[PDB]
Amino acid sequence: MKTNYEIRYAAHPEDAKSYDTTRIRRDFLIEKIFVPNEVNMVYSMYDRMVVGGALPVGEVLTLEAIDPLKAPFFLTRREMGIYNVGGPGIVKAGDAEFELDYKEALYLGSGDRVVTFESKDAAHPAKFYFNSLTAHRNYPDRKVTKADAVVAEMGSLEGSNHRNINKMLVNQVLPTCQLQMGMTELAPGSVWNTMEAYFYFEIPEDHAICHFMGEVGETRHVWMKGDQAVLSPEWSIHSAAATHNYTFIWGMGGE
Amino acid sequence: MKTNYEIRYAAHPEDAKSYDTTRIRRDFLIEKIFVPNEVNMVYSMYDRMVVGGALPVGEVLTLEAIDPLKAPFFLTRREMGIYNVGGPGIVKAGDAEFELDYKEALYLGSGDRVVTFESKDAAHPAKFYFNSLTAHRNYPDRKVTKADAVVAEMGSLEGSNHRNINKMLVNQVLPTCQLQMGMTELAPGSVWNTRMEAYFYFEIPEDHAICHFMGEVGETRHVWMKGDQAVLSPEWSIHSAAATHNYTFIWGMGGE
Predict the structure, then answer these.
(1) Which chain A residues have a beta carbon less than 8 Å from that of B21?
(2) Can you spell out the DSSP letters for B103-131?
(3) What are phi and psi of B30, to 5 degrees?
């Protein structure tokens, strides 16, 4: 068991236009999400979003109240949405207990509760990706699958952007303070996705995603792999083109 | 008829990494290729490649020996590859005469000859796109169509890069000094295109765009392009591209 976190500052669009590739990767790209028996987190000064991953491999991992939360429990005054993008797993929060398989999601509300992550089989570990935002009041926990989602079909073969948007941890489904999350699945041969955090997965290891950012007319990009996330500022665009189809999770807060 | 040209200098990758979007567009993108009864040309200090277009609309257009050539004729000490990407047209070079329809190509060798471009019907004008490099000896002219091409099918549905590479003005088909050119046609639903190279994109709807990548590996940039535009790709630069729709592109290269 080990928790790593880092704080990342927000930025001005006028300054970001001069960033080089190294600077863009340092500030926006999150490369180290899943490491065996680690919980790895980025605390973003864009709306105080925490983006993280937990990878239990023969251990139960605890969600620790990192220093910048200034709270005895991670969810003391926070809410979070969790997706499993690996093998079957279990999330516990206080005495509540949820089974999550591949591509299933879970909202947890505020409260002084111990949160733990575990895999049913260490040979096929759970990969828990999560976003978290502040929460000034509790709302009930809910497990949410694609079955409970508002689905929207978009794009076409011609435009290489045929995809299903699964709106899951959204206002139409369940109450939350500010966190909204969903999952969008590109059809075979579609590669375009025509503050927000984007996490990409279900893409082979030899392929890549070009994630776009910056202001219109001054666009930049960052090259990403599966199981990596990116912070997309309020002032930034957020298109992506990969070298193969993929799925991605999106999350957002604020106003 | 009017001829416009501009000279564009080469760049060091160390300097290019600080270019903003405006500077990248200015130096690397060739936005204005086809204008009625103009020949528009760029002379690049990357291998002294000339990239240009000629759009004859009720006029016969002459290929002029622009000043940076310092020669009595454009082809005095040069060779060129022409593609027609519009309606039927005719290229004359000296007393030689070549009919070019859509997606047909033509190599002209060096020599003191007048070259002209014309459309058969002004209502359906020919769109002549060309690349030219220096040539220290003559090689015979030749028209080359897809039927003459060394064709290689590449990619797949899954990689959105299913394409036919038509290697047309290449060493396997005909001798040239250094110029080689070909045409790659992406399948419906495929958008990815893969020394100094020039890329020209077409057969894509007006409302769609090509995102052309450039820069060193680990320091990449991009430029958004439209159909009937070209881009110069330095020897130190990557050259992949992803469009929002399928397309065809012509490629030309020289050097070593």
Answers:
(1) 217-219
(2) T-EEEE--SS--EEEEES-TTS---EEEE
(3) -115, 100
Residue A247, CA distances (Å) to A183, A207, B72, B73, B188 in order: 7, 13, 60, 57, 22
By the 8 A CB rule, do A191 and A243 touch?
A: yes
Task: Classify the C-alpha dihedral A81-A76-A141-A47 as positive or negative.
Answer: negative
Q: What is the largest CA-CA distance in chain A?
A: 52
Rounded distance between C-alpha atoms, residue B34 and residue B31, angstroms: 9
Resolution in A: 1.9
Nearest Cα residue to B158 out of A243, A156, A206: A243
Cβ atoms B42, B5 nearer than 8 A: yes
Residues in chain B: 256
Nearest to B238 by CA among B200, B196, B209: B196
Helix (H, G, I), strand (E, B) or coil at A16: helix
Experimental determination approach used: X-ray
Q: Domains along chain B?
A: 2-11+34-144 (2.60.120.520), 146-253 (2.60.120.10)
Q: Alpha carbon B35 to chain centroid distance?
A: 16
In angstroms, how far is the first alpha carbon of chain B from the final one? 36
Q: Rounded to a whole number, what is the distance in Å from the CA of A188 to chain B's nearest CA? A: 6
List the structure tokens of B13. Answer: 């990758």
Cβ–Cβ below 8 Å for B158 and A218 = no
State the alpha helices, DSSP H only, in chain B: 13-16, 21-28
Contact yes or no for A241 and B20 at CB 8 A: no
Sign of torsion over alpha carbons A51, A55, A61, A67: negative
Question: What six digits make up the tokens of B197?
Answer: 């190279």
Q: Do B242 and A190 touch (CB under 8 A)?
A: no
Distance of CA B144 to the CA centre of its chain: 15
Provide the residue type at A132 as one letter.
Answer: S
Place of tokens 């503050």: A195
Judged on CB neighbours under 10 Å (0-12, 13-18, 19+), B67 is exposed
3-state DSSP assignment of residue A41: strand
Q: Are B118 and B64 in contact (CB under 8 A)?
A: no
Closest approach of B213 to chain A, Cα-based (Å): 10
For residue A14, the SS3 value is helix
Q: Which residue does chain A place closest to B162, by CA atoms?
A: A189
- C-alpha separations of A206 from A123, A160, A239 in Å: 23, 20, 21
Residue of A nearest to B188 (CA): A158
CA distances from B23 to B11, B68, B151, B217 (A): 12, 23, 37, 20
A76, A110 Cβ separation under 8 angstroms: yes
- Strands B38-44 vs B49-54: parallel, antiparallel or unpaired: antiparallel
Q: What does the block give as tokens for A91?
A: 């999330």
Identify any residues that bridge with B79 across adjacent strands, giving them in sequence order: B133
Closest CA of chain B from A230, distance in Å:
17
A157 in contact with B, Cβ within 8 Å: yes
